[PDB]
């Protein structure tokens, strides 16, 4: 469940199929965006996990697993940034802000696209009888 | 596995059964690719575009001009096309603080138009998105409770009126909505 | 010293006799020395099917032997024949010098080296694996991982939470053959009142187990400050207990013997129990489509004995003061009224105002929950489809109104008085419509007003103003009328 | 401040429930009891007071017992009391350094004591066997230290020293009652246990009216009267443990915090009786040694004279306890002076301990002012004036009652001294009240 290995798959495909040059930058930007998203998510989830652990409702090994993921994310982001420098020269200071923006933009786009599916669950759950033009015919 | 088109430069998964996360990621990659192909400068800036904003404003104004003409059906279509173009033809790296307020400003008018027209489920979903994306105002809960009362959901209508009064306790319309909700719920329970 | 062991069986009989009497005496002495009406206890076992009875069924000699041993040893003592100190011991001789000399030391070595550390490590590894709530560590890890990566755009339903439950690690310890898809299928078969065919004795086990799982899931979802998942978990608990899928007209479909194909097709305006009790006692049967008086009385007795709530007075209280001040510790005090779906509304002004006040004494304000802890327990619920037997419960959780996040773990109450549901107050009917408060039997001192006190867990803010909250008190058994109120604390200094 | 890397048990990151604490306490106690029964291998100066007070037995792996740990603890307690370590609560690294220096000095003390006992003790001078005999004590003392540290880190209901002492006291009480051993002195076989010999004489003698009076008195060995008296004294001491003065207090920093501050009767229970007992033991030892070394001296005759062994006609004769009611009724002046001395010593020791240990009313008033609490129906400037009327009287009367209980127990001839029974009762009541106030099975 990640965009990490998809970039590596596209990279390995590049050496054989002669794909364009911007597909690699697209996959790289997507990976950086996902890394930023996960870093912020962990940064906001740390206190709640800590309190659940102190109260005694999470176990003893999950806390170590969480503290390991906290640094795995930083390692992955540093690797992404090094690859970004390798792929285009002098593109390390703008890459981070561009990723920071695309993260929010694509999250908003997902939330907006979800409403078409969100609309039929409520019809099924409340037993609405709606004809064309969205009006209620009871 | 996943195949790469030649003339269209779009990557597609050749597999028969693909997960949802993989499909969302491939769609995002396709969007980034078709944006980078068009954007010519290698060191692109988060500065928003101008021609795209001019076209979106033109579509939105051509949609709003039908309200003065008292044509309520096609103005909604024009506003919907404007919102679709704003969501489709805009690059992901453009500024968030300039991309979100325009969506709010157009979705508000689309909501008003759908509520005047008679579609309450579409309007309710638009209110729910506009409320869950970070816009909490007493002018939203009025419309949300109106929709929930129009499609006969009284517990949620009461909760919405209560949360709307918890933010602006001096409002004069949420009080009438709460009175109507209490009356309908007392007739529903007994 | 240098002891001398008993070589003629002259001392160890008395020692063994004393050791036996010191254990027999107290046991014999102990053996010689040794508020809430439930109406559904009888009506439940008459509607439970035999397939669940079989599941619920299937899934002092020490004193006598000690006394006969004492008699044998006493007769043996009486049958026997009987300057520096010569010390001695009481144990027999063959225990230390006969042919059983290495047996004692090998038994000591074994019982000290193998049985002790093995069992200690087993107990340690078995007590270290479970969570303080009562669920496995892997189950809690799965729940936390489910709530970590949860898309807020997705809407929570019952199917989603069943899919989440089907991955419990404790379902695999019972039946290591089945897969999570089979568990989800069995849960759907239970809720939709379908016949599994062969795995009924596994359906019943996992359904009875879902109690602790749903409680732990509710705990974790309140720990992550999520309201939608908490409400979904409570609704799923209701559906699992009553064996009914969540629909609009569910309060009237949880009843014992109704036919959905007739009720749903004929009427469409009856959605609650009060709307049902608006009609006469024969029109209710004609609408529900059962037309059997001896069989209508049971459903009419079930429909008018499930509890609904209602508030009389709700406010924030701080123990020892008269108002809320910045950085103080208040709590929530509710005065509710458990009523039947058949009784009319009594005006709040009729309450004598003597039952709503709080006593101001040091013994009462040192701990304000002792008076609440005196109420009777809740009676047994009417759930003919749940395998085991359940007592009722109410889960009360409080959240905020500025952002809309749950701000503390849920309190679960178990003691409450259902006195207002007894059949002696049957004059108080909704259909008579004659202002039954001016009745010869109506005495406002006979109706009980229960109390609920929720510790708040967070002190008042350091600023000054009105801060609004939201309190929700839901049942975990029925589809009754719950509480949903908003209240503000006026931190005034 | 230095470098130290030595084994130690890590504290639990979270609170341990009550059952996991009780089971670990039981297992540690079982290990400590099994360790003291197995003798050494290289084996081929009797100090009964030290071995009885410091939970030790000679000729086994537990010869030193908890002696080095308790000596290091007392040494560093004195060093902290004399304000030489100048330990400040503003730093935690200083506390960690002190706690690790505790163990790094305790291990050296263990090594030195083991070497001294091996080179001087009655084992014998004749080298690998001596190395093995020293290594046994080395590893046994290390195990005891690790066990105490484990029980004190949070896996046990409390400390280790108090638990071990209470266990030894209870074991002695029960062995003096249910001893299976016998003694044959002319008359025949007679059990050394009260209940065992009671049942034996009730069964085999076949003369009940005589067997009862013979087994109930037993002037030479333990009898049933002492069992009855010690049970009665146990129940009475348990009743006097619940006495407490509860004054109502309320908070003013964060309002809505109402509580009760209890002031027990046994304010400083364990300290005065144990200090007085150690003092009398040391005095008796010194007097015995000086009387043995010197045939006759005026001041040596005055301090203490020993005869048929027990002290008589001397200063040490007065301080020695009365055995039974006969000695009491014989000489009234000795009873008077002994009672007065034993009560005054306890009272003064209790007052001195509440003045030294930092539990004086002034320190309690300072703590009240710090936390922000006040007395319910009184002012702010009067908390100290109110505590002065409560705490000193409580300490004095607790000491006097402990002394009176010890005298009554030693006079009624129970199975154990009143000091031992009271210490064990307080040690167990501590665990009981902790489990009650915290909440656990």
């Amino acid at each position: 469940n990640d965009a990490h290995d998809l970039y590596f798959q596209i990279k390995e495909m590049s050496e054989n199929e002669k794909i364009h040059e911007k597909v690699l930058k697209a996959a790289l930007l997507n990976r950086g965006a996902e890394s930023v998203r996960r870093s912020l998510k962990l940064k906001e989830l740390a206190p709640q996990i800590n309190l659940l652990y102190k109260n005694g409702s999470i176990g003893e090994d999950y806390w170590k697993r969480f503290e390991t993921e906290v640094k795995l994310i930083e390692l992955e982001f540093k690797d992404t940034l090094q690859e970004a420098e390798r792929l285009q020269p002098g593109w390390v200071q703008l890459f981070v802000m561009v990723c920071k923006e695309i993260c929010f933009n694509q999250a908003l786009s997902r939330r907006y696209q979800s409403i078409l599916k969100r609309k039929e669950v409520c019809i099924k759950e409340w037993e609405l009888k709606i004809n064309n033009d969205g009006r209620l015919v009871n | 596995t996943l195949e790469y088109n030649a003339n269209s430069k779009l990557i597609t998964a050749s597999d028969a059964v693909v997960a949802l996360s993989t499909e969302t990621n491939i769609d995002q990659i396709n969007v980034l690719t078709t944006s980078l192909i068009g954007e010519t400068n290698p060191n692109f800036t988060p500065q928003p575009n101008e021609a795209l904003s001019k076209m979106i404003k033109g579509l939105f104004e051509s949609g709003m001009k039908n309200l003065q003409q008292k044509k309520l059906n096609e103005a909604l279509k024009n506003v919907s096309l404007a919102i679709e173009m704003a969501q489709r033809k805009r690059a992901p790296w453009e500024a968030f603080a300039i991309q979100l307020p325009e969506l709010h400003f157009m979705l508000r008018s689309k909501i008003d138009l759908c509520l005047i027209l008679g579609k309450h489920l579409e309007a309710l979903q638009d209110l729910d998105f506009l409320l869950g994306t970070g816009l909490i105002q007493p002018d939203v809960f009025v419309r949300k409770a109106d929709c929930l009362l129009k499609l006969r959901q009284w517990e949620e209508a009461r909760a919405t009126c209560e949360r709307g009064l918890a933010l602006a306790p001096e409002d004069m319309k949420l009080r009438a909505l709460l009175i109507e909700t209490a009356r309908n719920l007392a007739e529903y329970n007994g | 010293t240098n002891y001398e062991y008993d070589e003629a069986s002259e001392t160890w009989p008395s020692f063994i006799l004393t050791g036996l009497l010191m254990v027999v005496g107290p046991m014999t002495l102990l053996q010689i020395y040794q508020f809430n009406e439930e109406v559904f206890k009888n009506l439940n076992e008459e509607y439970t099917s035999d397939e669940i009875k079989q599941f619920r069924r299937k899934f002092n000699i020490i004193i006598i032997v000690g006394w006969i041993l004492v008699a044998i040893l006493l007769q043996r003592i009486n049958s026997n024949d009987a300057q520096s100190t010569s010390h001695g011991i009481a144990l027999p001789r063959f225990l230390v010098d006969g042919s059983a000399s290495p047996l004692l030391v090998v038994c000591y070595v074994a019982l000290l080296g193998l049985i002790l550390p093995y069992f200690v490590s087993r107990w340690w590894a078995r007590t270290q694996s479970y969570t303080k709530k009562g669920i496995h560590n892997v189950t809690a890890s799965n729940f936390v991982s489910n709530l970590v990566n949860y898309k807020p755009s997705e809407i929570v339903t019952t199917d989603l939470i069943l899919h989440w439950l089907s991955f419990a690690h404790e379902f695999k310890q019972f039946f290591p053959d089945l897969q999570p898809t089979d568990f989800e299928k069995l849960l759907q078969d239970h809720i939709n009142r379908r016949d599994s065919g062969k795995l009924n004795n596994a359906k019943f086990r996992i359904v009875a187990k879902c109690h602790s799982l749903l409680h732990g899931l509710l705990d974790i979802a309140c720990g992550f400050r999520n309201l939608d998942i908490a409400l979904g978990a409570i609704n799923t608990f209701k559906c699992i207990v009553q064996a009914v899928p969540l629909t609009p007209n569910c309060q009237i479909l949880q009843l014992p013997n109704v036919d959905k194909e007739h009720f749903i097709t004929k009427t469409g305006d009856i959605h609650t129990l009060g709307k049902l009790f608006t009609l006469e006692d024969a029109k209710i049967g004609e609408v529900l489509g059962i037309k059997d008086q001896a069989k209508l009385n049971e459903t009419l007795r079930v429909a008018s004995h499930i509890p609904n709530l209602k508030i009389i007075k709700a406010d924030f209280l701080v123990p020892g003061e008269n108002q809320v001040t910045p950085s103080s510790t208040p709590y929530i005090s509710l005065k509710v009224l458990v009523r039947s779906a058949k009784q009319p509304l009594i005006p709040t002004s009729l309450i004598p105002e003597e039952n709503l006040t709080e006593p101001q004494d040091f013994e009462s304000q040192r701990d304000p929950f002792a008076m609440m802890s005196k109420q009777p327990l809740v009676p047994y619920s009417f759930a003919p489809f749940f395998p085991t037997k359940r007592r009722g419960s109410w889960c009360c959780l409080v959240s905020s109104q500025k952002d809309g996040k749950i701000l503390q773990t849920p309190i679960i109450i178990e003691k409450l008085s259902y006195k207002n549901l007894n059949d002696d107050k049957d004059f108080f009917d909704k259909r008579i419509k004659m202002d039954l408060t001016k009745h010869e039997k109506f005495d406002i001192n006979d109706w009980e007003i229960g109390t609920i006190k929720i510790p708040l867990g967070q002190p008042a803010p350091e600023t000054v103003g009105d801060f609004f909250f939201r309190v929700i008190v839901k049942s975990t058994d029925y589809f009754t009328t719950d509480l949903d109120i908003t209240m503000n604390m006026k931190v005034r200094d | 401040p230095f470098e130290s890397f030595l084994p130690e048990v890590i504290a639990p990151e979270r609170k341990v429930p009550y059952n996991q604490k009780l089971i670990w306490t039981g297992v540690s106690l079982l290990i400590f009891l099994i360790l003291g029964q197995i003798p050494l291998y290289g084996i081929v100066d009797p100090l009964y007071w030290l071995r009885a007070m410091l939970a030790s037995n000679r000729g086994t792996l537990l010869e030193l017992g908890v002696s080095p740990i308790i000596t290091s603890s007392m040494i560093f307690q004195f060093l902290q009391g004399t304000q030489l370590l100048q330990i400040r609560p503003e730093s935690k690294q200083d506390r960690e350094l002190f706690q690790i220096a505790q163990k790094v000095c305790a291990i050296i003390l263990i090594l030195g004591q083991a070497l001294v006992v091996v080179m001087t003790g009655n084992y014998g001078a004749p080298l690998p066997i001596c190395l093995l005999l020293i290594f046994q004590l080395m590893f046994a003392s290390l195990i005891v230290m690790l066990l105490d540290e484990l029980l004190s880190k949070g896996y046990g209901l409390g400390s280790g020293i108090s638990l071990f002492t209470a266990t030894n006291i209870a074991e002695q009480i029960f062995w003096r009652a249910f001893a299976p051993t016998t003694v044959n002195s002319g008359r025949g076989k007679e059990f050394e246990g009260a209940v065992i010999a009671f049942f034996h004489l009730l069964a085999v003698r076949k003369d009940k009216k005589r067997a009862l009076v013979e087994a109930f008195y037993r002037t030479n060995l333990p009898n049933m009267f002492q069992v009855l008296m010690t049970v009665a004294i146990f129940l009475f001491v348990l009743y006097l443990q619940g006495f407490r003065y509860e004054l109502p207090i309320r908070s003013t920093k964060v309002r809505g915090q109402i509580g009760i501050y209890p002031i027990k009767l046994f304010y400083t229970s364990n300290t005065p009786i144990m200090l007085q007992s150690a003092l009398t033991s040391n005095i008796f030892l010194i007097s015995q040694i000086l009387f043995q070394k010197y045939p006759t001296n005026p001041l040596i005759r005055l301090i203490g004279v020993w005869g048929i062994q027990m002290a008589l006609s001397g200063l040490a004769y007065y301080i020695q306890p009365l055995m039974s009611l006969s000695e009491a009724l014989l000489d009234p002046i000795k009873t008077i002076v002994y009672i007065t001395f034993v009560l005054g010593s306890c009272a003064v020791f209790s007052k001195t301990w509440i003045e030294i240990s930092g539990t004086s009313p002034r320190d309690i008033a300072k703590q009240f002012k710090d936390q922000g609490m006040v007395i319910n129906g009184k002012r702010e400037t009067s908390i100290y004036r109110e505590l002065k009327k409560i705490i000193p009287t409580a300490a004095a009367f607790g000491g006097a009652t402990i002394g009176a209980l010890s005298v009554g127990s030693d006079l009624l001839g129970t199975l154990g001294s009143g000091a031992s029974i009271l210490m064990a009762t307080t040690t167990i009541y501590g665990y009981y009240e902790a489990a009650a106030k915290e909440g656990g099975f």
Binding site: - | - | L112, P117, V120 | V9, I10, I38, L40, Y41, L147
Partner: protein, 32 residues
């Protein structure tokens, strides 16, 4: 660094080693 089970194992091992040394020294004299 050290767990409670490690302390229990060390204690039981030391006790069993001493007991085994004793019984071996006892059986050696009986054998020769």
């Amino acid at each position: 660094r050290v767990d409670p089970l490690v302390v229990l194992f060390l204690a039981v091992g030391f006790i069993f080693s001493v007991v085994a040394l004793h019984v071996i020294s006892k059986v050696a004299g009986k054998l020769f």
